[PDB]
Amino acid sequence: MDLKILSLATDKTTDKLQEFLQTLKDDDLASLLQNQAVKGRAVGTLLRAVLKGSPCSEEDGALRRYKIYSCCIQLVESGDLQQDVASEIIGLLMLEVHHFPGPLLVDLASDFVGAVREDRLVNGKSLELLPIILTALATKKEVLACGKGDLNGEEYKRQLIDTLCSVRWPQRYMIQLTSVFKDVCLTPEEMNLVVAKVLTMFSKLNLQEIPPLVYQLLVLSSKGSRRSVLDGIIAFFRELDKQHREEQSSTAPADELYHVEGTVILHIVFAIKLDCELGRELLKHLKAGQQGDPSKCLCPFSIALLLSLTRIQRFEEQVF
Amino acid sequence: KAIERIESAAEHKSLDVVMLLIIYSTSTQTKKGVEKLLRNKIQSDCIQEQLLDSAFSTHYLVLKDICPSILLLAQTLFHSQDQRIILFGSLLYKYAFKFFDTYCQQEVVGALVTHVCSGTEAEVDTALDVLLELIVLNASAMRLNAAFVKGILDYLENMSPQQIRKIFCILSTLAFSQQPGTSNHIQDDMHLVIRKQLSSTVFKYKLIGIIGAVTMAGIMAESEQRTQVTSLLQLVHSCTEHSPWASSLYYDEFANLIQERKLAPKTLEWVGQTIFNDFQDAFVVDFCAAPEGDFPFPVKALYGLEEYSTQDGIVINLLPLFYQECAKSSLCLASHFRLLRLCVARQHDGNLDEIDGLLDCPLFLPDLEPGEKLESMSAKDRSLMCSLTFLTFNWFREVVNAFCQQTSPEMKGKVLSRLKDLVELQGILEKYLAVIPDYVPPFASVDLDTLVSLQNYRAFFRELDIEVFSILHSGLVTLGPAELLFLLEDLSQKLENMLTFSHLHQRSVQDIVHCVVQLLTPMCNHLENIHNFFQCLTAQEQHTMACCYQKLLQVLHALFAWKGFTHQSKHRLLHSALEVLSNRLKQMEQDQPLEELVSQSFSYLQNFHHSVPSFQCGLYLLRLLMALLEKSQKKEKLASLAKQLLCRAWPKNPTFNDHLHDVLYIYLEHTDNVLKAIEEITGVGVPELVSAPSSTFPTLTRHTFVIFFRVMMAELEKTVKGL
């Protein structure tokens, strides 16, 4: 069958390509699960042919692409594919995901939301589509036919994101879940949600997995809200410090907690170095001023932070 | 104060640099004082790489406690224009990294990464140049801090095409140093962004993927190796194929990766097969002189060499292709030619025989030649004649790139005519420009720029490499003057950018200097001698050769004005260039001392003066001679040379005025007691009002007088504060 689809990529659009499509309908799972396993490069051009044989100017082509896409997502994260093959698959998906109509895009991104509930993905590689998916929705301000209608591309985009904040994020993939919001443009309300939810999950991770997570949160803030990003990180460790000071008066803990704070700090001082408004937001946040506050403001951690910031030339004098 | 005095002697030793770093780190009041002094020292042509070298290699242990200041020096030095200070600011960062503690090497990498992301134009180029050299110096330590370098990726959207190339060059070089065949921190994530970049509709973000991906593949090209690289390259061609902008880029980025890195003949022969077929398919047609389709122009197959058979197959498809695109790939013609051209060359040892018919080709084109009779017949037709002239001009610009290196003498003949056709084309190009104004965007881009008229068209040319300058080997005629200038003008624009562009900057400076000594001197020595004999013995002949005379004296000058000749090593390069200027007579000694070589050259160039057509050509000769002396009587010789320039008869604009001030500045500066030369101007300065408001020893008027007096005064004041 493969070669006969290679002739269709030669002669002409529509009649050649889409005629052989409607004749199958049986199964796209068994073919791609295998014809990938012989030579992965037989699949690469397989997508290119089938996808241009199913444009979005025809519903039978559109509604077929939706099934195609679904089948390309599962395998990437399911079977063990040479990364070379798995990548190529996703690359082409991201490539051709441009012209999907409003109705189908929502359906596509909603299957990620369903997968987010319970899935062992082993690959956030599925999630690489979400960024481009939502930004495509942002390109259409007109109502789409779904549900009751009365919703723009941006709103579905907003509502889609709100659903992502509500569901449980799997402990394994939350690094990749978060780094997906990093490729999307956000509203100030959407940002505080992505940030806050990510924070909400902090105390549910083993300590040593927090430091790389902070860096991922730090690269979001560049476009986002700094005060909260700083507020959570600081106050998370502030509460974490309190527990350690209480065991000391009532070695074992010291090697982890204080090493992590040394990693977390060193990350946000380097973030302030690449981005200044994050530093000025840190100072304006920690400003003592009223004297009830400097008791509640500075703590061992936030002070270790400032001292560490002394390394940067500009903020040196302001901090002291 | 003991250091600032010796600024009057440029040869002061290395210990001065070591001591300035100590004084800098002592107190804050010495900081700002040192800092300015250090800048005025670097702009004094003092404290060069050479000195900072011996300062660090010997003294690193002494300087180990001065580190954070040394790094604070790097900063405030990095923050100025005038790269000379930025370089020295970068040389601090590097010599730090070289011999020093880890914690020191952790901040150096960090400080440099920052200069990259938030820095300015120069700051980012220079920072990425050092970050490259660091891997060369110490790789294993470079990879330990790589987490900071990755952060650069997040700022990719703000960078240029050059730097995107520069940034991926670094990250991938680290990734493959850690382990071959595996995938670690850097490898994966830079694959991640490469995917997310290629899949954007906006070209600005495809530019990032196209360059970054071809660079990765380029570096990992040195069974599992080729399949990885191939899959990476095909993922690029599928993304880039829809837009003629993108695919031309990918073809140029592919054309880069093939000529630079040395890959496996087995990996080269893989991706090479598609290129030969894809090319003949798109752009190549047979000789039917009637092409298919309705073009309201007399479309012929234009300008082959005709030494190539009239009855025969091959002609390029340009017009029928460019017309169909306009109304409803032809922009990928030149990019595809370079790629194919390098593919065959690299699999054949440089034998182009299979493609050689491509240099003999005509193109299917309406007559572009005059717009002169057809003038004032316009709109669509005038934008079509402009870019068709343009597109072709680039074709024969790229073809001269291909066949300049070929051996056979008939093959050098075939290039030399493409050089005249490249000359006529460029005149025809500017004919359409001064005619069709301001409504004329081009259909192609150049150096990726950002998102045309006379000024800009220069930049939309393609790039001639220095191998093309090997055409300069031949002589002249009563290769004529027109083609000579064409090369001489490209050279000068290159040597301004190097010693004072992409493919140029992507080979080392030394190479370009080494080659430009061979390529020019025992050529121009022959070419110069033809210009002199001509100016000793017509409308265009004068105008063109008087220009070739300049471009020569501009180029020769740019070579010996090379500020890297101060270093030990370059003495050998200098010895060559100086002894290649050593033949009016033979060489009695092979090893002759540098000092004589200087004057043998000087004298050789001193007589050239009387032939000089314009006030300019006298200046650039002076400047040339003057740059020889700086290598080592001659001071007075220069005066008489400047005397004559203001004296003998010459055939409104600041040009003339500015060059005068340059001459009078050289005149009064190098001579004997200046009162003597000043009285001459004081006594014969009078004839202005008294005759016919010109003079004996002329060039004195209302506007030419004020120029004199400024140099007159300033020099008197210079000698007054001297004693």
Curated annotation (Swiss-Prot), chain A:
Signal peptide: none annotated. Deubiquitinated by USP1 as cells enter G2/M, or once DNA repair is completed. Monoubiquitination requires the FANCA-FANCB-FANCC-FANCE-FANCF-FANCG-FANCM complex. Ubiquitination is required for binding to chromatin, DNA repair, and normal cell cycle progression. Monoubiquitination is stimulated by DNA-binding. Phosphorylated in response to DNA damage by ATM and/or ATR. Phosphorylation of FANCI promotes ubiquitination of FANCD2, which prevents DNA release from the FANCI-FANCD2 complex. It is found in: Nucleus; Cytoplasm. Homodimer. Part of a FANCI-FANCD2 heterodimeric complex that binds and scans dsDNA for DNA damage. Interacts with FANCL. Interacts with MTMR15/FAN1. Interacts with POLN. Interacts with UBL5; the interaction promotes FANCI homodimerization. Plays an essential role in the repair of DNA double-strand breaks by homologous recombination and in the repair of interstrand DNA cross-links (ICLs) by promoting FANCD2 monoubiquitination by FANCL and participating in recruitment to DNA repair sites. The FANCI-FANCD2 complex binds and scans double-stranded DNA (dsDNA) for DNA damage; this complex stalls at DNA junctions between double-stranded DNA and single-stranded DNA. Participates in S phase and G2 phase checkpoint activation upon DNA damage. The C-terminal 30 residues are probably required for function in DNA repair. Belongs to the Fanconi anemia group I protein family. This is Fanconi anemia group I protein homolog. It comes from Mus musculus. The chain holds residues 1 to 327 of 1330 of the full protein.
Curated annotation (Swiss-Prot), chain B:
Disruption phenotype: Mice display delayed pre- and postnatal development, defects in germ-cell development, and increase incidence of microphthalmia and tumors of epithelial cell origin. The chain holds residues 364 to 1247 of 1450 of the full protein. Monoubiquitinated on Lys-196 during S phase and upon genotoxic stress by FANCL in complex with E2 ligases UBE2T or UBE2W. Deubiquitinated by USP1 as cells enter G2/M, or once DNA repair is completed. Monoubiquitination requires the joint intervention of the FANC core complex, including FANCA, FANCB, FANCC, FANCE, FANCF, FANCG, and FANCM, and proteins involved in cell cycle checkpoints and DNA repair, including RPA1, ATR, CHEK1 and BRCA1, and is mediated by FANCL/PHF9. Monoubiquitination prevents DNA release from the FANCI-FANCD2 complex. The lineage of its organism: Eukaryota, Metazoa, Chordata, Craniata, Vertebrata. There is a cross-link at K196 (Glycyl lysine isopeptide (Lys-Gly) (interchain with G-Cter in ubiquitin)). Homodimer; cannot be ubiquitinated and does not bind DNA. Part of a FANCI-FANCD2 heterodimeric complex that binds and scans dsDNA for DNA damage. Interacts directly with FANCE and FANCI. Interacts with USP1 and MEN1. The ubiquitinated form specifically interacts with BRCA1 and BLM. Both the nonubiquitinated and the monoubiquitinated forms interact with BRCA2; this interaction is mediated by phosphorylated FANCG and the complex also includes XCCR3. The ubiquitinated form specifically interacts with MTMR15/FAN1 (via UBZ-type zinc finger), leading to recruit MTMR15/FAN1 to sites of DNA damage. It comes from Mus musculus. Required for maintenance of chromosomal stability. Promotes accurate and efficient pairing of homologs during meiosis. Involved in the repair of DNA double-strand breaks, both by homologous recombination and single-strand annealing. The FANCI-FANCD2 complex binds and scans double-stranded DNA (dsDNA) for DNA damage; this complex stalls at DNA junctions between double-stranded DNA and single-stranded DNA. May participate in S phase and G2 phase checkpoint activation upon DNA damage. It is found in: Nucleus. This is Fanconi anemia group D2 protein homolog. Belongs to the Fanconi anemia protein FANCD2 family. Coiled coil: none annotated. Signal peptide: none annotated.
